[PDB]
Design an enzyme around this catalytic site. Structure first.
Site, PDB file in Angstrom:
ATOM      1  N   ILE A  51      54.354  14.663  61.717  1.00 39.02           N
ATOM      2  CA  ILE A  51      54.674  15.256  63.654  1.00 39.02           C
ATOM      3  C   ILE A  51      53.797  13.526  64.343  1.00 39.02           C
ATOM      4  CG2 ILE A  51      53.204  16.738  65.013  1.00 39.02           C
ATOM      5  CD1 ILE A  51      54.194  18.719  63.341  1.00 39.02           C
ATOM      6  N   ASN A  52      52.886  12.718  63.777  1.00 37.02           N
ATOM      7  CA  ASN A  52      52.219  12.147  64.146  1.00 37.02           C
ATOM      8  C   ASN A  52      53.357  11.445  64.814  1.00 37.02           C
ATOM      9  OD1 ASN A  52      50.024  12.784  66.000  1.00 37.02           O
ATOM     10  ND2 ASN A  52      48.936  12.701  63.952  1.00 37.02           N
ATOM     11  N   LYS A  54      56.356  11.311  64.133  1.00 36.51           N
ATOM     12  CA  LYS A  54      57.327  11.355  65.358  1.00 36.51           C
ATOM     13  C   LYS A  54      57.060  11.522  67.154  1.00 36.51           C
ATOM     14  CE  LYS A  54      59.278  14.283  61.852  1.00 36.51           C
ATOM     15  NZ  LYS A  54      60.330  16.204  61.796  1.00 36.51           N
ATOM     16  N   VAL A  97      60.737  22.865  65.689  1.00 30.52           N
ATOM     17  CA  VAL A  97      60.260  23.662  64.562  1.00 30.52           C
ATOM     18  C   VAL A  97      59.789  23.344  63.435  1.00 30.52           C
ATOM     19  CG1 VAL A  97      59.116  25.380  63.953  1.00 30.52           C
ATOM     20  CG2 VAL A  97      60.422  25.776  65.831  1.00 30.52           C
ATOM     21  N   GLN A  98      59.187  22.389  63.445  1.00 33.39           N
ATOM     22  CA  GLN A  98      58.548  21.637  62.126  1.00 33.39           C
ATOM     23  C   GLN A  98      58.517  22.889  60.160  1.00 33.39           C
ATOM     24  OE1 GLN A  98      57.874  18.992  62.020  1.00 33.39           O
ATOM     25  NE2 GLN A  98      57.829  17.602  59.903  1.00 33.39           N
ATOM     26  N   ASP A 123      66.932  19.074  65.493  1.00 35.36           N
ATOM     27  CA  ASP A 123      66.862  18.803  64.360  1.00 35.36           C
ATOM     28  C   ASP A 123      67.932  19.548  63.462  1.00 35.36           C
ATOM     29  OD1 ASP A 123      64.602  17.785  63.508  1.00 35.36           O
ATOM     30  OD2 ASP A 123      63.983  19.040  63.096  1.00 35.36           O
ATOM     31  N   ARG A 171      70.270  20.895  47.270  1.00 36.00           N
ATOM     32  CA  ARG A 171      71.049  22.347  48.171  1.00 36.00           C
ATOM     33  C   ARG A 171      69.876  22.038  49.740  1.00 36.00           C
ATOM     34  NH1 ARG A 171      72.424  27.715  44.144  1.00 36.00           N
ATOM     35  NH2 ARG A 171      70.297  27.386  43.494  1.00 36.00           N
ATOM     36  N   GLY A 263      59.241   3.325  53.081  1.00 36.56           N
ATOM     37  CA  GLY A 263      59.685   2.692  53.549  1.00 36.56           C
ATOM     38  C   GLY A 263      61.131   2.426  54.260  1.00 36.56           C
ATOM     39  N   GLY A 264      61.531   4.014  53.248  1.00 38.86           N
ATOM     40  CA  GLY A 264      63.392   3.962  53.148  1.00 38.86           C
ATOM     41  C   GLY A 264      63.396   5.150  54.299  1.00 38.86           C
TER      42      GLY A 264
HETATM   43  N1  LIG Z   1      62.729  12.146  55.365  1.00 35.36           N
HETATM   44  C1  LIG Z   1      62.762  12.095  54.324  1.00 35.36           C
HETATM   45  O1  LIG Z   1      62.249  11.199  53.323  1.00 35.36           O
HETATM   46  C2  LIG Z   1      63.138  13.223  54.330  1.00 35.36           C
HETATM   47  C3  LIG Z   1      62.421  14.367  54.738  1.00 35.36           C
HETATM   48  C4  LIG Z   1      62.616  15.905  55.167  1.00 35.36           C
HETATM   49  C5  LIG Z   1      62.331  15.334  53.062  1.00 35.36           C
HETATM   50  N2  LIG Z   1      63.079  14.788  52.436  1.00 35.36           N
HETATM   51  C6  LIG Z   1      62.151  15.074  50.973  1.00 35.36           C
HETATM   52  O2  LIG Z   1      63.223  15.535  50.034  1.00 35.36           O
HETATM   53  C7  LIG Z   1      62.695  16.791  49.153  1.00 35.36           C
HETATM   54  C8  LIG Z   1      62.733  18.034  49.220  1.00 35.36           C
HETATM   55  O3  LIG Z   1      62.522  18.341  50.099  1.00 35.36           O
HETATM   56  P1  LIG Z   1      63.688  19.855  50.282  1.00 35.36           P
HETATM   57  O4  LIG Z   1      63.236  19.579  51.993  1.00 35.36           O
HETATM   58  O5  LIG Z   1      64.658  19.167  50.147  1.00 35.36           O
HETATM   59  O6  LIG Z   1      62.709  20.787  49.710  1.00 35.36           O
HETATM   60  P2  LIG Z   1      63.543  22.508  48.840  1.00 35.36           P
HETATM   61  O7  LIG Z   1      63.547  23.210  49.704  1.00 35.36           O
HETATM   62  O8  LIG Z   1      62.105  21.848  47.972  1.00 35.36           O
HETATM   63  O9  LIG Z   1      64.207  21.557  48.230  1.00 35.36           O
HETATM   64  C9  LIG Z   1      64.546  21.525  47.092  1.00 35.36           C
HETATM   65  C10 LIG Z   1      65.942  20.910  46.295  1.00 35.36           C
HETATM   66  O10 LIG Z   1      65.619  20.232  45.173  1.00 35.36           O
HETATM   67  C11 LIG Z   1      66.638  21.285  43.938  1.00 35.36           C
HETATM   68  N3  LIG Z   1      65.583  20.879  42.698  1.00 35.36           N
HETATM   69  C12 LIG Z   1      64.605  21.503  42.647  1.00 35.36           C
HETATM   70  N4  LIG Z   1      63.602  20.843  41.629  1.00 35.36           N
HETATM   71  C13 LIG Z   1      64.946  20.071  40.972  1.00 35.36           C
HETATM   72  C14 LIG Z   1      65.484  20.111  39.442  1.00 35.36           C
HETATM   73  N5  LIG Z   1      64.262  19.236  38.199  1.00 35.36           N
HETATM   74  N6  LIG Z   1      66.672  19.483  39.413  1.00 35.36           N
HETATM   75  C15 LIG Z   1      67.640  19.711  40.180  1.00 35.36           C
HETATM   76  N7  LIG Z   1      67.398  20.717  41.320  1.00 35.36           N
HETATM   77  C16 LIG Z   1      65.998  20.512  41.692  1.00 35.36           C
HETATM   78  C17 LIG Z   1      66.593  22.824  44.547  1.00 35.36           C
HETATM   79  O11 LIG Z   1      67.369  23.165  43.950  1.00 35.36           O
HETATM   80  P3  LIG Z   1      66.764  25.467  44.118  1.00 35.36           P
HETATM   81  O12 LIG Z   1      68.123  25.615  45.546  1.00 35.36           O
HETATM   82  O13 LIG Z   1      67.804  25.704  43.302  1.00 35.36           O
HETATM   83  O14 LIG Z   1      66.008  25.418  44.292  1.00 35.36           O
HETATM   84  C18 LIG Z   1      66.290  22.178  46.223  1.00 35.36           C
HETATM   85  O15 LIG Z   1      67.854  22.502  46.468  1.00 35.36           O
HETATM   86  C19 LIG Z   1      60.775  15.939  49.800  1.00 35.36           C
HETATM   87  O16 LIG Z   1      60.464  15.325  48.714  1.00 35.36           O
HETATM   88  C20 LIG Z   1      60.842  15.986  50.767  1.00 35.36           C
HETATM   89  O17 LIG Z   1      59.578  15.089  51.201  1.00 35.36           O
HETATM   90  C21 LIG Z   1      63.625  13.502  53.040  1.00 35.36           C
HETATM   91  N1  LIG Z   2      61.846  20.632  61.497  1.00 33.46           N
HETATM   92  C1  LIG Z   2      61.698  19.561  60.376  1.00 33.46           C
HETATM   93  N2  LIG Z   2      60.633  20.301  59.397  1.00 33.46           N
HETATM   94  C2  LIG Z   2      60.511  19.076  58.740  1.00 33.46           C
HETATM   95  N3  LIG Z   2      59.933  19.712  57.491  1.00 33.46           N
HETATM   96  C3  LIG Z   2      60.768  18.150  58.765  1.00 33.46           C
HETATM   97  N4  LIG Z   2      61.015  16.572  57.734  1.00 33.46           N
HETATM   98  C4  LIG Z   2      60.086  15.644  57.959  1.00 33.46           C
HETATM   99  O1  LIG Z   2      59.700  15.606  59.465  1.00 33.46           O
HETATM  100  N5  LIG Z   2      60.201  14.418  57.106  1.00 33.46           N
HETATM  101  C5  LIG Z   2      59.386  13.074  57.683  1.00 33.46           C
HETATM  102  C6  LIG Z   2      59.549  12.515  58.583  1.00 33.46           C
HETATM  103  C7  LIG Z   2      59.114  11.267  58.714  1.00 33.46           C
HETATM  104  C8  LIG Z   2      58.718  10.838  57.471  1.00 33.46           C
HETATM  105  C9  LIG Z   2      57.719   9.321  57.836  1.00 33.46           C
HETATM  106  O2  LIG Z   2      57.345   9.299  58.257  1.00 33.46           O
HETATM  107  N6  LIG Z   2      57.928   8.578  55.863  1.00 33.46           N
HETATM  108  C10 LIG Z   2      57.410   6.949  56.746  1.00 33.46           C
HETATM  109  C11 LIG Z   2      55.765   6.942  56.325  1.00 33.46           C
HETATM  110  C12 LIG Z   2      55.692   7.916  55.294  1.00 33.46           C
HETATM  111  C13 LIG Z   2      54.400   7.939  54.300  1.00 33.46           C
HETATM  112  N7  LIG Z   2      53.435   8.623  54.230  1.00 33.46           N
HETATM  113  N8  LIG Z   2      52.594   7.455  52.924  1.00 33.46           N
HETATM  114  N9  LIG Z   2      52.395   6.422  53.811  1.00 33.46           N
HETATM  115  N10 LIG Z   2      53.742   6.119  53.951  1.00 33.46           N
HETATM  116  C14 LIG Z   2      57.533   6.755  54.535  1.00 33.46           C
HETATM  117  O3  LIG Z   2      58.338   7.360  54.072  1.00 33.46           O
HETATM  118  O4  LIG Z   2      58.267   5.605  54.709  1.00 33.46           O
HETATM  119  C15 LIG Z   2      58.852  11.434  56.293  1.00 33.46           C
HETATM  120  C16 LIG Z   2      59.222  12.486  56.532  1.00 33.46           C
HETATM  121 CL1  LIG Z   2      59.221  13.725  54.573  1.00 33.46          CL
HETATM  122  C17 LIG Z   2      62.044  17.375  60.192  1.00 33.46           C
HETATM  123  O5  LIG Z   2      62.547  16.791  60.124  1.00 33.46           O
HETATM  124  N11 LIG Z   2      62.639  19.144  60.440  1.00 33.46           N
END
Ligand SMILES: NC(=O)c1ccc[n+]([C@@H]2O[C@H](COP(=O)([O-])OP(=O)(O)OC[C@H]3O[C@@H](n4cnc5c(N)ncnc54)[C@H](OP(=O)(O)O)[C@@H]3O)[C@@H](O)[C@H]2O)c1
Ligand SMILES: Nc1nc(N)c(NC(=O)Nc2ccc(C(=O)N[C@@H](CCc3nnn[nH]3)C(=O)O)cc2Cl)c(=O)[nH]1
Ligand SMILES: NC(=O)c1ccc[n+]([C@@H]2O[C@H](COP(=O)([O-])OP(=O)(O)OC[C@H]3O[C@@H](n4cnc5c(N)ncnc54)[C@H](OP(=O)(O)O)[C@@H]3O)[C@@H](O)[C@H]2O)c1
Ligand SMILES: Nc1nc(N)c(NC(=O)Nc2ccc(C(=O)N[C@@H](CCc3nnn[nH]3)C(=O)O)cc2Cl)c(=O)[nH]1
Lengths: 286, 285
Positions: A51-52, A54, A97-98, A123, A171, A263-264
């Protein structure tokens, strides 16, 4: 070795562009600012941090972002009073809503998310917006920010998507499932995996494009990567250090492009939220 | 060779069970009957064929089915008048717009389709119902009738869907895309193909479950079918009637296979009947 997709760098370019848009928009229409509102339930450490980030991206760009933090003991009725209020406040162009909610009581996440007006759903989480993207009506709707940033990271390689085989792993409502639709309507042949996929490694090896959102630290091994693959890692995992969902060291020896963690995808997610928010402020003027 | 999946037999079973459900509802709720409505635009022959098929089936089950056929020249604002009346009419439990619209004036199918109240979109074509299914909330919505009948057919094999690789060929709003959603929330690993896919044959050969909705007669050769695959052919292609899969050589390698016709077809009609009975039961409460 694979070329790094510098997410931290690429997003800076987006935010600078977004700033010049917002500054130009207050000089073209005086007395007007994009207004974003993030709603939080509870006090999750990771949610507080994201949140911070963003809020900060919104400060740098020119977006007036409010943050409302409700306590853990919040009832689902109480959160509706905020959603109702934000929907009807015309000064608020988009709100989110986060997720997930951190509440001791029982809150119907879907009922809450789906009380957001679709034209403020920056979102892309309402069923309405998900249904358009899920059915290919991509210019009618908000697309979730992480898939959005993921797609832009793919295009930065300059490899055309269409005709390529993409494997999405996971998924979920916020990442995996919308990621699948975006790849599909960019004319990739897409394969979705999840926790019940048999022989996950064999599937992953089919991926020319590989997007991983599993929340399972370094579970996708480098040996699984198809040689020369574009590899997008959404993972953020806190371990004895920050790693992603792909074993980054071994995978960089086989990918042609790879996202680092951190960073990605992270910075790219926040930028596309900022972009979507600006985009709905413009549509509001029209 | 493969066991044949009989849509005529399985659908005749389903319509019969629907029938008895309506009979018992009418006993408990004296003077209450499920009511469907089919809006059409234009005079496409094939549409008249399938619309009759549905009307007959509804009359078999005891579903009151009205058919409104607007002329090929109607205005978008005209269909909205009807759609709105159908929405506001409390004696109508569900209704649908046969697609594709046959109009002289360019008419936004999407705006037409999305005026239908979700509570009555027994065809599952509204964006609200599409996004519920596409994100796993399957209780919330009406699933589109053809993917519903292909799921019923696959389950007639008795082989669980979970952990299996399913290849859905086609991504249309009506068959292909909702078919991927249904298989994914049945825990298949799902690969979706379309006209831009390269090496269709190799993607097809991955398919433990294979669903084809191309509208390209017999285009999926049976030499691509994975040996032992469960094959669902949604096509209806007049040349006689053939499907989207090369039936002959497919039957040699499949474990189960649906014939064209009397495969998905009667299941489609039966699933719309079931969704309609669903709408009516919910209406009483
Ligand atoms: N900016 C970003 O980087 C960003 C933003 C938000 C989240 N993410 C990251 O994405 C990751 C997942 O977040 P999410 O919202 O998708 O969470 P989630 O609701 O836990 O979704 C996890 C997904 O991965 C699948 N999965 C879990 N374990 C698995 C395994 N061993 N083999 C294959 N598939 C598996 C699950 O399948 P099932 O449906 O069968 O459980 C589910 O679809 C987190 O590390 C989160 O930080 C990306
Ligand atoms: N409604 C709603 N609910 C949710 N939960 C989500 N998801 C979400 O906000 N995701 C999210 C947002 C920003 C970052 C970020 O800024 N990542 C940097 C820095 C991290 C780091 N940590 N330590 N050092 N660096 C990096 O990955 O480089 C990472 C993530 Cl997972 C949404 O999008 N909408
Ligand atoms: N009850 C039933 O059995 C039933 C119900 C409905 C439909 N059907 C039959 O299903 C068939 C398809 O109908 P539809 O609604 O899906 O129509 P459509 O809108 O034409 O959809 C055809 C789909 O096939 C995909 N496709 C994949 N490979 C292709 C190739 N090599 N050439 C052409 N298209 C290819 C297309 O991808 P793109 O998106 O890239 O074009 C498209 O999504 C028709 O024969 C129809 O009669 C019958
Ligand atoms: N809103 C909306 N719009 C739409 N367009 C559709 N699609 C649709 O209704 N399709 C459809 C329906 C029933 C049949 C059927 O009854 N098939 C029989 C006999 C076929 C035959 N023809 N000639 N000889 N035999 C068989 O296959 O056994 C076949 C088809 Cl394609 C929809 O569902 N909802």
């Amino acid at each position: 070795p694979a070329e790094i997709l510098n997410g931290k760098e690429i997003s800076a370019q987006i935010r600078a562009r977004l700033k010049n848009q917002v500054t130009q928009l207050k000089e073209q229409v005086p007395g007007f600012t994009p207004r974003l509102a993030i709603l939080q339930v509870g006090n999750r450490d990771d949610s507080n941090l994201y949140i911070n980030v963003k809020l900060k991206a919104a400060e740098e760009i020119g977006i007036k972002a409010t943050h409302i933090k409700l306590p853990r003991t919040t009832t689902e009725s109480e959160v509706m009073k905020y959603i109702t209020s934000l929907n009807e406040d015309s000064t608020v162009h988009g709100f989110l809503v986060q997720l997930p909610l951190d509440s001791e009581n029982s809150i119907n996440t879907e009922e809450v998310i789906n009380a957001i007006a679709p034209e403020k759903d920056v979102d892309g989480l309402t069923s309405i917006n998900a249904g358009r993207l899920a059915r290919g009506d991509l210019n009618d709707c908000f697309i979730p920010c992480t898939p959005k940033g993921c797609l832009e990271l793919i295009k930065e390689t300059g490899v055309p998507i269409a005709g390529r085989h993409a494997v999405v792993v996971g998924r979920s409502k916020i990442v995996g499932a919308p990621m699948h639709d975006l790849l599909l309507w960019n004319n990739a042949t897409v394969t979705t995996c999840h926790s019940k996929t048999a022989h996950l490694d064999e599937e992953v090896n089919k991926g020319d494009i590989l997007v991983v959102a599993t929340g399972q630290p370094e579970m996708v091994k480098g040996e699984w990567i198809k040689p020369g693959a574009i590899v997008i890692d959404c993972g953020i995992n806190y371990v004895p250090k920050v790693v992603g969902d792909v074993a980054y060291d071994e995978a960089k020896e086989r990918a042609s492009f790879i996202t680092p963690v951190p960073g990605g995808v992270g910075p790219m997610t926040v930028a596309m939220l900022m972009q979507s928010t600006v985009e709905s402020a413009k549509r509001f003027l029209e």
